[PDB]
Structures are given as C-alpha cells and as structure tokens.
C-alpha cells in the first residue's frame, strides 16, 4: 500500500530566453494538487486537496515574491549554466542500411535504414531508388530515446530489388553541415 | 523550445526519495541520497557543472512530510498501480563479434519501484550491466532504462525480466540476433 507525493519545478523557454514560464507544481499520487504559474503570479489549486496550500502559501509574501522572481533567479539562471552541454549538444548520426528478408532478385522485402547514435532528436530521413525519392509506403518506427542523451530511429522501405538498383538513405541532422548518404544495390 | 525540470518524488512506505534534473527529456543528474552526493548521467557533465547536494536532501524531507500530510486528508486513498510497458532494443546496429549494447525500456508505470533482471540464455546476468534511477514523464508516470553489454553471437539469446505490482506475473521480453 504505497503513497506517492511528486514535485516538479519546470522552466519553459521560448525563443532562447526572451519569454520564460516557471511552473512549480506539487503532485499527489499522480494527481496534481497545487501549482504556481509565473503567468499568473500566485499559487492556484487544481483539485480539492490543494486549496489549503493554495491559501497558506499565497499568504506568505516572502514566498510569493521569491516565486514570482524565480523566473530569472531559477530558470534563466540554470539555462545559462547548462546551455553549452545541453541546449547546444550535437552528436552526428551513424547510418546503416540492410535488407530485411532473404530472397533472390524479384521477390519483395523490407529495406531498413537505421539512423542511430544522434542528438538532438530533431532529424529528417529520406529514401531514394536510383535517384528518385520515395514518399509512399514509408513506415517509420518514430524517434527513440536511448536514455544516454542519444536518439535513434528506423525507417523501413519495401520493394522488389531488381538487378542494378541503388537504394539510398539520405539523412539530414543539425550535427551535420551536409547530409549523410548510404546506398545499397542488388 | 527546451525545458528543464527539477523532478522530485517521495514515497511511503518504501521511503524511497529522489531528486533529479531533466532536460528536454533526459536526466542531467540526480542526488545520491546515501552517498549524500551528486550523480551525473554523463561524466562529461561534471567537468562542466556542479550541484550542492545537501540542499536536495532538504526538499525530499519537506516532501516526505508534505506526503504524510496529504496521505491523511485524502482518507488514505492509496496509489493505483500502473502496469509498465516493456521493450528491448540495441543501442546501435548489430554485427557478430562487434560489441554492442542491449537496452530495456521500462516505460509508463507507477509507483517508482520496480525489479529488473537481464538474462543470457536463461541465466541472470550480473556483470556488464547498468541502469538509471526512476525518470519522470510528462504524464506523471515513470520511465526506467537498463543496459546490458554484449558481443552478438548466434547461440546466445537474451531476456529482460521485469516485475512490478501492476502485473500478475513478471513481464518477460525477448531478443535475439535478427
């Protein structure tokens, strides 16, 4: 019979650090009770349980005044401390392509383009067959968060490898000044 | 459009307390209670930053109490377990004889208490394994990662056994070369 009390201090940034929203929220089991939204400037109750704290705290002026300023003393503060290794972290993606099925020419199988070991997550992937870009029937596994500040994705493509074809996976990512290409033939 | 989140949680009876920093989804660090110190997700971060750990311990304390307080005027409404979705992937594409890493994503669960085990050919693996404290998630549930280091082989096969109150029987996801 567990009881859980969460607490989250989040700083939201828009356009570098020109507009910032501090959000201090105290959560019960998984039910958020009270919160302080810099965009309001005072604690508000989200459910019944929080009302008490919503009052007791909104009464403490040294508290409110500290909270309202937290937007800089806290948010804009840490943002600038960890910017270099967080906001501007860049890791090039290593790309690998490989046929799913095992079948002689003329038989219809998946082509997988593994785009791994990259950060930020923001990335674009494209499929090419003999210079003509593919758009239809492209399945994507979506983006993966490896947990070690690294992303990964899989973009599959089905076809009927005919002799002489050249499938190429083209990737574009912030860590790259020029797209990375990987071909594959029959 | 980045976000920094000082996510902290405390839970009874377990008395497991956690304090951590999150950025755009990944953890920057957490404060090791026992060691009363700071633990960086990436050693590089350390050469880059610093954090006075003693102050984290404070918050958790208030948290522990804040809980006890809420745990009461809720009419002891207990936490409703949420089953964890489990999955397995390699950090990078696999080639025989090419050392790689198996990832086990334990995602979308609660409470932040769980039991994980890596299995190589049926047997539990003990060396070459690491993990992460309970990571927060926008939906207020938790995320957990585990890592096994291996050397792809045809005979070898693995399993990430996960247990959690929200399940009847432990969860067992499989993985093997191709």
């Amino acid at each position: 019979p567990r009881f859980l009390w969460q607490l989250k201090f989040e700083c939201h940034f828009f356009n570098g650090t020109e507009r910032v929203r501090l959000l201090e929220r105290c959560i019960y089991n998984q039910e958020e009770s009270v919160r302080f939204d810099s965009d309001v400037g005072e604690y508000r109750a989200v459910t019944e349980l929080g009302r008490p704290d919503a009052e007791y705290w909104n009464s403490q002026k040294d508290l409110l005044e500290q909270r309202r300023a937290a937007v800089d003393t806290y948010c804009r503060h840490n943002y600038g401390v960890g910017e270099s290794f967080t906001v501007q972290r860049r890791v090039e993606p290593t790309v690998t392509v490989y046929p799913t099925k095992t079948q002689p020419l003329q038989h219809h199988n998946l082509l997988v383009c593994s785009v791994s070991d990259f950060y930020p997550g923001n990335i674009e992937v494209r499929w090419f067959r003999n210079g003509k870009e593919e758009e239809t029937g492209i399945v994507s596994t979506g983006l993966v968060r490896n947990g070690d500040w690294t992303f990964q994705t899989l973009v599959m493509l089905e076809t009927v490898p005919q002799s002489g074809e050249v499938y190429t996976c083209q990737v574009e990512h912030p860590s790259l000044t020029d797209p990375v290409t990987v071909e594959w033939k029959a | 459009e980045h976000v920094i989140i000082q996510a902290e949680f405390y839970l009874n009876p377990d008395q497991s307390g956690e304090f951590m920093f999150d950025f755009d989804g990944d953890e920057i660090f957490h404060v090791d209670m026992a060691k009363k110190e700071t633990v960086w997700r990436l050693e590089e971060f350390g050469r880059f930053a610093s954090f006075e750990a003693q102050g984290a311990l404070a918050n958790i304390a208030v948290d522990k109490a804040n809980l006890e307080i809420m745990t009461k005027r809720s009419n002891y409404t207990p936490i409703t377990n949420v089953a964890p979705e489990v999955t397995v992937l390699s950090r990078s594409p696999v080639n025989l004889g090419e050392p790689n890493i198996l990832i086990c994503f334990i995602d979308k669960f609660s409470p932040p208490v769980v039991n994980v085990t890596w299995l190589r050919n049926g047997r539990p693996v003990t060396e070459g394994v690491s993990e992460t404290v309970f990571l927060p998630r926008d939906d207020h549930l938790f995320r957990k990662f585990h890592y096994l280091t291996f050397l792809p082989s045809t005979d070898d096969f693995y399993d990430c056994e996960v247990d959690h109150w929200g399940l009847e029987e432990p969860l067992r996801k499989h993985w093997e070369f191709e």
Binding site: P52, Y56, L63, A70, Y74, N78, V81 | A65, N66, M70
Partner: peptide, 14 residues
C-alpha cells in the same frame, strides 16, 4: 561552478 535548486514551501498541516 553551476546549478541552483528551487527550494519548496511546506504543506499546511491537516
């Protein structure tokens, strides 16, 4: 040389 923690208020006893 860095990171601050955002202190927190205490709950209303109940």
């Amino acid at each position: 040389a860095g990171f601050k923690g955002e202190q927190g208020p205490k709950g209303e006893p109940g």
